[PDB]
Amino acid sequence: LEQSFDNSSLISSVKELLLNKDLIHPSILLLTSHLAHYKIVGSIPRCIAMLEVFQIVIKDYQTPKGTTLSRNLTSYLSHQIDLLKKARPLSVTMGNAIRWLKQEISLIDPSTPDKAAKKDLCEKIGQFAKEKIELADQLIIDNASTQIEESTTIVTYGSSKVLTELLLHNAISLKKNIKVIVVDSRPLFEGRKMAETLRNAGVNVMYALITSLDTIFNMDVDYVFLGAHSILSNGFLYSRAGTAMLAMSAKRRNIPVLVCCESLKFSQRVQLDSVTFNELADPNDLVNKNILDGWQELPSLNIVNILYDLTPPEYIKKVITEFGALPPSSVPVILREYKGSA
Amino acid sequence: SDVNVTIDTFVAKLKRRQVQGSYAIALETLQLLMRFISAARWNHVNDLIEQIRDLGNSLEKAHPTAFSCGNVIRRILAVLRDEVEEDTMSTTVTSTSVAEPLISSMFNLLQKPESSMKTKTDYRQVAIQGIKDLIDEIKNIDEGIQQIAIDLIHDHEILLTPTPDSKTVLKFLITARERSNRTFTVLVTEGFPNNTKNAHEFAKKLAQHNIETLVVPDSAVFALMSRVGKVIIGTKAVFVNGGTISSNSGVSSVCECAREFRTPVFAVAGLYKLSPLYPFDVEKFVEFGGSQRILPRMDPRKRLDTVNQITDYVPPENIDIYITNVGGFNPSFIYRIAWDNYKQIDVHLDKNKA
Amino acid sequence: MSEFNITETYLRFLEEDTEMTMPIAAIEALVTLLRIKTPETAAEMINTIKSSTEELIKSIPNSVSLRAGCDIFMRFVLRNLHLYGDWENCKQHLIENGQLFVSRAKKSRNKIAEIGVDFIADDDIILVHGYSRAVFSLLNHAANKFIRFRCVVTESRPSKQGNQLYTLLEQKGIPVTLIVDSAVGAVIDKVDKVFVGAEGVAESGGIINLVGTYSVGVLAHNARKPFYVVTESHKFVRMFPLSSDDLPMAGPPLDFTRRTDDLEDALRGPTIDYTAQEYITALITDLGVLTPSAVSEELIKMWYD
């Protein structure tokens, strides 16, 4: 009660809707069903999957009689976003795409016979993720590869989002020697997906848990690379929980730390505290007859499960985007030069 | 002329502290500036910046350590320094508009080769609104403050400020309790023996809005620093390093004692509180006070010596954020906001361009 | 008929005067390269310098201040070919700019001495390290202003330069001591300010000059003194590490091969260190005083495209 972070109302556990005024897309319920019951995403996997259902749901237009297609879809698509907000609040990978999409709703005129409404939207929103994601990730590949020598180590955290493809390129598409250290944490064992993949790729993978983190650093170790969820306007890395403890330690143990990221994952907002702006996710998950049951109904017990947390930018040495590399204090200068400009 | 004596009594207004604070001197240097705008016959657009750059050197040389007057004159030059290049390329034919606001500043000195057609009078009236839009910005800087700080601060933490003489946080923590109904407390120390006039005034009005407040002495602020994990500092002016020119007394060492406990250190500052200058000497901006109110006995025969100080300076390593009207910012980012408001010529505001 | 590569133009004038330094000597060689050899076509002109700069890197691989000179000359002729003159005027429009840097980058250092005045204040004991000649011209202006200070010169080992600076300004008339670089940590408490100078600035703000500017930099941060650094506006290179390991001279900084007959053993370690943004606090340009975050953005403002 003294910190009262349990009464930080960033999320509730509300469910069970029945309303049928909107024609709810059945497949967008599947997307929310695939998130909230068991999380299967990073952030750019959402930015793919949020776009996967959007190409389908615009194809079923269902434009009514006395309404322009500019007038209904700004309500029709945005009503379906609140289904996701019941499941999981948005990211900036969510956020920067959808406001760009709401521009495209507004910049059309009453001239389209709804047959032309596909290809002016379909390839355009396809060339979004073709440019802003795919070949944006291509420029990640050449930039990080020249900053990695052979016969070294990489320490990652959680499931990566883009540097999985980077580790595939340096182990197979360039065949230089490399050892991989993947560490994830209870409850979301998403780093095991990388641990399956890179040894299916056939490379030296050492799996790890965050409680045993010191003895990884007591060996020959360097080049700590990180996934990301958003970068603050200061330089704080808003990312998956438990990122900063290796980010403080490897910076304390004088070997450099980088964050693989992109310009789409920037943001205008700013903060400097970990427990201010976050999300909780269903406190039943940290249980597994069990050992304890009854965080409810029992006096003086609670289960927290932090999803996102900030890292100080002094821990990060170099921030790499698709345009290049940059020091972490110099993050917000792209916000005036490329994001909404490029 | 008649405007030449109103500047002289304004020169007289800046000698013997006829106005204080970082707020009221900026409004009154600018209303007085419009009289010079309305009674000027420049006859060339580079003469009008000459009409104002000597006036600042009739002001900044007259009194250096006031800055809310000192940064307006450069900024109101910059809105005309913008529009010299506006009518320059629009007069030409080939490359009338590129309109990207940033050219690479390293290369620009390193490449040297050598309808509103003219409408020469408009530089007056665009400065007449340039009079008006600056003040109307200053009147409601606190809305951009309050949009981001309740985002930045949370509910249940004890607090501390060393600057009771900040009318920003005097007004801000009213609505930080009122609209956002967060409950907390504030520790408050004194600017001994100078802001202790207002330090007892500060928590009393906060006792009216009853935010669990209590007054600490200046010596005790280390002993309770282990409990508090957040400090806000209402500064007076801020330079290009992110080292800010703070209020009167006591606030620098407690900003240092805050930094040693790995405690985040907050600051609030209006956009007009910015200054494009550099702190070359710390001691040329640290102004002192008097031997009067620090000991009143005035011995002529024993006659020891004693030191007052009515300006504290902090390095940018001891500061963390700048809660401004346009967002929160890094201590090292301060140039880019400033160079979007100031130019490289009038920062050396002096007639001798040596 | 010259070829401008090694010594048929370049190493001529490096024996002319030790007032011109290494990168602008390459800039002086690069602007006179396309001046005489002007092959009346925009295509092979830049293909001439891409041949010529890459052999110039191949000429001396371990003077990467030249690489900064090899970097920004391409940045010069790119935007100078911009303004869209279809190469018709841009032959003359480049060479009418032409002799800019032999008139402008030569007056870098006095312009540093114009604006670097109000750092060395009344009674500042000054720690210098290595012959970064913009510091001495700032100190030349300090003696010519008759402002009061003192000076402390470190070593420059193995590059010997500290023995020169003691002889260089004692004749100028400044009270000065030469100290060993080993005795920095026991003396730095009395020292108040400290001046160095980089051979090139990296992307976060880099000190890519000498052997132990990072050693004296990390001393000064625990001494909590303002670690200034003096350079100018043509000393920028994209080359940017993540650790304090740059490209070395020829081998790794921990060799373990043996002495064959009498080989030099002090010269086994590195000769160039690196310092990130954390340990500097301010720097000087021809543009002005510059914070270590703005030196990142101006090194990226015309560098991404």
mmCIF file of C-alpha atoms in Angstrom, chain A residues 81-308:
data_model
loop_
_atom_site.group_PDB
_atom_site.id
_atom_site.type_symbol
_atom_site.label_atom_id
_atom_site.label_comp_id
_atom_site.label_asym_id
_atom_site.label_seq_id
_atom_site.Cartn_x
_atom_site.Cartn_y
_atom_site.Cartn_z
ATOM 1 C CA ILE A 81 -8.938 -1.688 -32.307
ATOM 2 C CA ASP A 82 -10.817 -1.551 -28.993
ATOM 3 C CA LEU A 83 -11.119 -5.338 -29.197
ATOM 4 C CA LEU A 84 -7.316 -5.424 -29.091
ATOM 5 C CA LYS A 85 -7.275 -2.907 -26.225
ATOM 6 C CA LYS A 86 -9.292 -5.384 -24.170
ATOM 7 C CA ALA A 87 -6.641 -7.994 -24.988
ATOM 8 C CA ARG A 88 -3.451 -5.918 -24.967
ATOM 9 C CA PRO A 89 -2.735 -2.162 -25.098
ATOM 10 C CA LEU A 90 -0.867 -0.898 -28.118
ATOM 11 C CA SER A 91 2.804 -0.386 -28.872
ATOM 12 C CA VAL A 92 4.412 2.271 -31.027
ATOM 13 C CA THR A 93 4.813 -0.471 -33.641
ATOM 14 C CA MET A 94 1.043 -0.604 -33.358
ATOM 15 C CA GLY A 95 0.739 3.141 -33.065
ATOM 16 C CA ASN A 96 2.796 4.593 -35.898
ATOM 17 C CA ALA A 97 1.210 2.304 -38.485
ATOM 18 C CA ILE A 98 -2.406 3.006 -37.570
ATOM 19 C CA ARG A 99 -2.191 6.813 -37.565
ATOM 20 C CA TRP A 100 -0.418 6.538 -40.911
ATOM 21 C CA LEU A 101 -3.344 4.364 -41.994
ATOM 22 C CA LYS A 102 -5.832 6.977 -40.763
ATOM 23 C CA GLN A 103 -4.079 9.442 -43.061
ATOM 24 C CA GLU A 104 -4.860 7.131 -45.971
ATOM 25 C CA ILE A 105 -8.523 6.969 -44.964
ATOM 26 C CA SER A 106 -8.646 10.769 -45.036
ATOM 27 C CA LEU A 107 -6.734 11.441 -48.273
ATOM 28 C CA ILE A 108 -9.213 9.571 -50.495
ATOM 29 C CA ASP A 109 -12.062 11.350 -52.284
ATOM 30 C CA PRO A 110 -15.618 10.262 -53.198
ATOM 31 C CA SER A 111 -14.497 8.854 -56.556
ATOM 32 C CA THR A 112 -13.564 5.215 -55.934
ATOM 33 C CA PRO A 113 -15.986 2.561 -57.279
ATOM 34 C CA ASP A 114 -14.662 0.171 -54.546
ATOM 35 C CA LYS A 115 -12.932 -2.004 -57.155
ATOM 36 C CA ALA A 116 -10.106 0.542 -57.264
ATOM 37 C CA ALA A 117 -10.223 0.627 -53.436
ATOM 38 C CA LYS A 118 -8.079 -2.505 -53.203
ATOM 39 C CA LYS A 119 -4.926 -1.746 -55.166
ATOM 40 C CA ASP A 120 -4.540 1.890 -54.112
ATOM 41 C CA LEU A 121 -4.592 0.579 -50.513
ATOM 42 C CA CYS A 122 -3.276 -2.992 -50.862
ATOM 43 C CA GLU A 123 0.106 -2.449 -52.512
ATOM 44 C CA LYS A 124 0.543 0.874 -50.691
ATOM 45 C CA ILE A 125 0.074 -0.734 -47.291
ATOM 46 C CA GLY A 126 2.163 -3.601 -48.640
ATOM 47 C CA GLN A 127 4.917 -1.184 -49.673
ATOM 48 C CA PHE A 128 4.708 0.141 -46.119
ATOM 49 C CA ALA A 129 5.937 -3.114 -44.571
ATOM 50 C CA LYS A 130 8.070 -3.761 -47.647
ATOM 51 C CA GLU A 131 9.970 -0.533 -46.969
ATOM 52 C CA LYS A 132 9.462 0.293 -43.278
ATOM 53 C CA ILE A 133 10.054 -3.297 -42.145
ATOM 54 C CA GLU A 134 11.625 -5.676 -44.655
ATOM 55 C CA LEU A 135 14.320 -3.705 -46.458
ATOM 56 C CA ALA A 136 14.654 -1.641 -43.296
ATOM 57 C CA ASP A 137 15.792 -4.923 -41.747
ATOM 58 C CA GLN A 138 18.100 -5.417 -44.744
ATOM 59 C CA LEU A 139 20.091 -2.318 -43.778
ATOM 60 C CA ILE A 140 20.397 -3.758 -40.260
ATOM 61 C CA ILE A 141 22.247 -6.748 -41.723
ATOM 62 C CA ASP A 142 25.223 -5.062 -43.395
ATOM 63 C CA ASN A 143 25.641 -2.530 -40.589
ATOM 64 C CA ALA A 144 25.848 -5.009 -37.720
ATOM 65 C CA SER A 145 27.951 -7.552 -39.639
ATOM 66 C CA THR A 146 30.897 -5.198 -40.128
ATOM 67 C CA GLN A 147 30.780 -4.434 -36.388
ATOM 68 C CA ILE A 148 31.164 -8.146 -35.521
ATOM 69 C CA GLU A 149 34.405 -10.084 -35.890
ATOM 70 C CA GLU A 150 34.707 -13.843 -36.184
ATOM 71 C CA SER A 151 35.117 -16.206 -33.196
ATOM 72 C CA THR A 152 33.316 -13.930 -30.726
ATOM 73 C CA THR A 153 30.206 -14.200 -28.542
ATOM 74 C CA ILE A 154 26.764 -12.576 -28.568
ATOM 75 C CA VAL A 155 24.519 -12.170 -25.519
ATOM 76 C CA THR A 156 20.842 -11.662 -26.355
ATOM 77 C CA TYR A 157 17.821 -11.355 -24.087
ATOM 78 C CA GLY A 158 14.386 -12.853 -24.634
ATOM 79 C CA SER A 159 13.066 -13.568 -28.077
ATOM 80 C CA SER A 160 14.710 -11.237 -30.529
ATOM 81 C CA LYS A 161 12.670 -9.517 -33.207
ATOM 82 C CA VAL A 162 15.151 -8.565 -35.941
ATOM 83 C CA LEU A 163 18.565 -9.778 -34.814
ATOM 84 C CA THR A 164 17.534 -13.416 -35.228
ATOM 85 C CA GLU A 165 17.889 -12.704 -38.948
ATOM 86 C CA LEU A 166 21.176 -10.957 -38.159
ATOM 87 C CA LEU A 167 22.509 -14.010 -36.310
ATOM 88 C CA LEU A 168 21.418 -16.234 -39.200
ATOM 89 C CA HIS A 169 23.385 -14.068 -41.630
ATOM 90 C CA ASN A 170 26.667 -14.149 -39.721
ATOM 91 C CA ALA A 171 26.548 -17.859 -38.873
ATOM 92 C CA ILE A 172 25.331 -19.226 -42.232
ATOM 93 C CA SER A 173 25.285 -16.517 -44.902
ATOM 94 C CA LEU A 174 28.800 -15.421 -43.878
ATOM 95 C CA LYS A 175 29.961 -18.561 -41.948
ATOM 96 C CA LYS A 176 32.183 -16.637 -39.531
ATOM 97 C CA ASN A 177 32.577 -18.259 -36.134
ATOM 98 C CA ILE A 178 30.214 -17.114 -33.397
ATOM 99 C CA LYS A 179 28.804 -18.358 -30.089
ATOM 100 C CA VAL A 180 25.283 -17.458 -28.997
ATOM 101 C CA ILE A 181 24.070 -16.796 -25.449
ATOM 102 C CA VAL A 182 20.270 -16.598 -25.238
ATOM 103 C CA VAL A 183 18.753 -15.806 -21.840
ATOM 104 C CA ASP A 184 15.049 -15.417 -21.078
ATOM 105 C CA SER A 185 12.974 -15.522 -17.922
ATOM 106 C CA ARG A 186 10.012 -16.923 -16.095
ATOM 107 C CA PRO A 187 7.156 -16.614 -17.071
ATOM 108 C CA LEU A 188 7.464 -15.939 -20.818
ATOM 109 C CA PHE A 189 10.020 -18.428 -22.151
ATOM 110 C CA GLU A 190 10.105 -16.756 -25.556
ATOM 111 C CA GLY A 191 13.900 -17.008 -25.773
ATOM 112 C CA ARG A 192 13.542 -20.777 -26.200
ATOM 113 C CA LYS A 193 12.071 -20.066 -29.645
ATOM 114 C CA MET A 194 15.443 -18.575 -30.565
ATOM 115 C CA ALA A 195 17.151 -21.487 -28.803
ATOM 116 C CA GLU A 196 15.241 -23.897 -31.031
ATOM 117 C CA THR A 197 15.895 -21.862 -34.168
ATOM 118 C CA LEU A 198 19.622 -21.133 -34.027
ATOM 119 C CA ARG A 199 20.542 -24.703 -33.146
ATOM 120 C CA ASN A 200 18.222 -25.826 -35.925
ATOM 121 C CA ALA A 201 20.424 -23.407 -37.864
ATOM 122 C CA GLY A 202 23.403 -25.261 -36.375
ATOM 123 C CA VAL A 203 25.410 -22.766 -34.316
ATOM 124 C CA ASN A 204 26.926 -22.819 -30.818
ATOM 125 C CA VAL A 205 24.026 -21.807 -28.565
ATOM 126 C CA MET A 206 24.334 -21.560 -24.782
ATOM 127 C CA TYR A 207 20.908 -21.163 -23.200
ATOM 128 C CA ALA A 208 20.728 -19.375 -19.861
ATOM 129 C CA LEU A 209 18.430 -18.128 -17.122
ATOM 130 C CA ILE A 210 18.568 -14.671 -15.597
ATOM 131 C CA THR A 211 19.132 -15.969 -12.054
ATOM 132 C CA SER A 212 22.464 -17.511 -13.138
ATOM 133 C CA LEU A 213 23.564 -14.450 -15.100
ATOM 134 C CA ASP A 214 26.964 -13.806 -13.485
ATOM 135 C CA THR A 215 28.778 -16.973 -14.589
ATOM 136 C CA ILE A 216 28.001 -16.169 -18.226
ATOM 137 C CA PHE A 217 29.849 -12.890 -17.721
ATOM 138 C CA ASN A 218 32.705 -14.660 -15.904
ATOM 139 C CA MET A 219 33.718 -16.323 -19.197
ATOM 140 C CA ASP A 220 34.992 -14.943 -22.504
ATOM 141 C CA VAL A 221 32.090 -12.631 -23.319
ATOM 142 C CA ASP A 222 31.424 -9.443 -25.329
ATOM 143 C CA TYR A 223 28.922 -7.897 -27.787
ATOM 144 C CA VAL A 224 25.671 -7.786 -25.822
ATOM 145 C CA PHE A 225 22.885 -7.153 -28.338
ATOM 146 C CA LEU A 226 19.273 -6.482 -27.420
ATOM 147 C CA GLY A 227 15.777 -6.572 -28.781
ATOM 148 C CA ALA A 228 13.543 -3.606 -28.159
ATOM 149 C CA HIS A 229 9.950 -2.432 -27.815
ATOM 150 C CA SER A 230 10.315 1.376 -27.988
ATOM 151 C CA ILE A 231 12.948 4.054 -27.405
ATOM 152 C CA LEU A 232 12.047 7.032 -25.226
ATOM 153 C CA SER A 233 12.711 10.616 -26.278
ATOM 154 C CA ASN A 234 15.581 10.770 -23.777
ATOM 155 C CA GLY A 235 17.238 7.517 -24.774
ATOM 156 C CA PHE A 236 15.612 5.118 -22.342
ATOM 157 C CA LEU A 237 14.920 1.695 -23.827
ATOM 158 C CA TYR A 238 11.358 0.619 -23.078
ATOM 159 C CA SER A 239 11.699 -3.130 -23.672
ATOM 160 C CA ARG A 240 10.943 -6.558 -22.194
ATOM 161 C CA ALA A 241 11.279 -7.129 -18.459
ATOM 162 C CA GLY A 242 14.710 -8.020 -17.126
ATOM 163 C CA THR A 243 16.597 -6.277 -19.927
ATOM 164 C CA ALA A 244 18.344 -3.693 -17.751
ATOM 165 C CA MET A 245 19.973 -6.099 -15.267
ATOM 166 C CA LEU A 246 22.310 -7.443 -17.909
ATOM 167 C CA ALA A 247 22.459 -3.951 -19.418
ATOM 168 C CA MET A 248 23.744 -2.584 -16.127
ATOM 169 C CA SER A 249 26.045 -5.550 -15.476
ATOM 170 C CA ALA A 250 27.709 -5.809 -18.887
ATOM 171 C CA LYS A 251 28.226 -2.045 -18.830
ATOM 172 C CA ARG A 252 29.590 -2.487 -15.305
ATOM 173 C CA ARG A 253 31.799 -5.305 -16.621
ATOM 174 C CA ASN A 254 33.213 -2.907 -19.276
ATOM 175 C CA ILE A 255 32.112 -4.747 -22.422
ATOM 176 C CA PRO A 256 29.867 -2.795 -24.809
ATOM 177 C CA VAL A 257 26.107 -3.142 -25.200
ATOM 178 C CA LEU A 258 24.101 -2.362 -28.339
ATOM 179 C CA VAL A 259 20.382 -2.222 -29.082
ATOM 180 C CA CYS A 260 19.234 -3.498 -32.462
ATOM 181 C CA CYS A 261 16.275 -1.296 -33.354
ATOM 182 C CA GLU A 262 14.650 0.730 -36.121
ATOM 183 C CA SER A 263 13.225 4.177 -36.800
ATOM 184 C CA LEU A 264 9.682 2.785 -36.703
ATOM 185 C CA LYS A 265 10.289 1.910 -33.032
ATOM 186 C CA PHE A 266 10.936 5.518 -31.998
ATOM 187 C CA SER A 267 8.409 7.583 -30.046
ATOM 188 C CA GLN A 268 7.490 11.155 -29.158
ATOM 189 C CA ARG A 269 6.691 10.368 -25.517
ATOM 190 C CA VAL A 270 9.221 10.661 -22.707
ATOM 191 C CA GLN A 271 9.656 9.362 -19.160
ATOM 192 C CA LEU A 272 12.474 8.209 -16.905
ATOM 193 C CA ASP A 273 10.863 5.807 -14.402
ATOM 194 C CA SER A 274 10.291 2.084 -14.859
ATOM 195 C CA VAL A 275 7.105 1.750 -12.822
ATOM 196 C CA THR A 276 5.103 4.640 -14.249
ATOM 197 C CA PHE A 277 3.792 3.530 -17.639
ATOM 198 C CA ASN A 278 3.566 -0.211 -18.099
ATOM 199 C CA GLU A 279 1.202 -3.182 -18.471
ATOM 200 C CA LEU A 280 0.295 -6.046 -16.146
ATOM 201 C CA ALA A 281 -0.651 -9.447 -17.572
ATOM 202 C CA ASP A 282 -2.886 -11.858 -15.605
ATOM 203 C CA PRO A 283 -1.139 -12.669 -12.272
ATOM 204 C CA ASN A 284 -2.150 -16.364 -12.367
ATOM 205 C CA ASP A 285 0.837 -17.034 -14.650
ATOM 206 C CA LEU A 286 3.590 -17.094 -11.985
ATOM 207 C CA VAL A 287 2.189 -20.191 -10.244
ATOM 208 C CA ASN A 288 3.094 -23.086 -12.541
ATOM 209 C CA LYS A 289 -1.771 -29.455 -6.950
ATOM 210 C CA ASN A 290 0.420 -26.351 -7.139
ATOM 211 C CA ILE A 291 2.650 -24.847 -4.445
ATOM 212 C CA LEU A 292 0.456 -21.848 -3.660
ATOM 213 C CA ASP A 293 -2.986 -20.874 -4.834
ATOM 214 C CA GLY A 294 -5.020 -17.911 -3.711
ATOM 215 C CA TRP A 295 -3.431 -14.588 -4.421
ATOM 216 C CA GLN A 296 -7.117 -13.721 -4.367
ATOM 217 C CA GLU A 297 -9.158 -14.140 -1.149
ATOM 218 C CA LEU A 298 -6.112 -14.432 1.115
ATOM 219 C CA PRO A 299 -5.048 -11.550 3.373
ATOM 220 C CA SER A 300 -1.898 -9.692 2.300
ATOM 221 C CA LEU A 301 -0.818 -11.397 -0.897
ATOM 222 C CA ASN A 302 -0.381 -10.140 -4.446
ATOM 223 C CA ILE A 303 1.334 -11.296 -7.625
ATOM 224 C CA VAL A 304 2.895 -8.713 -9.917
ATOM 225 C CA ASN A 305 4.251 -9.473 -13.378
ATOM 226 C CA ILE A 306 6.028 -6.522 -14.986
ATOM 227 C CA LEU A 307 6.111 -6.701 -18.772
ATOM 228 C CA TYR A 308 8.003 -3.557 -19.772
#
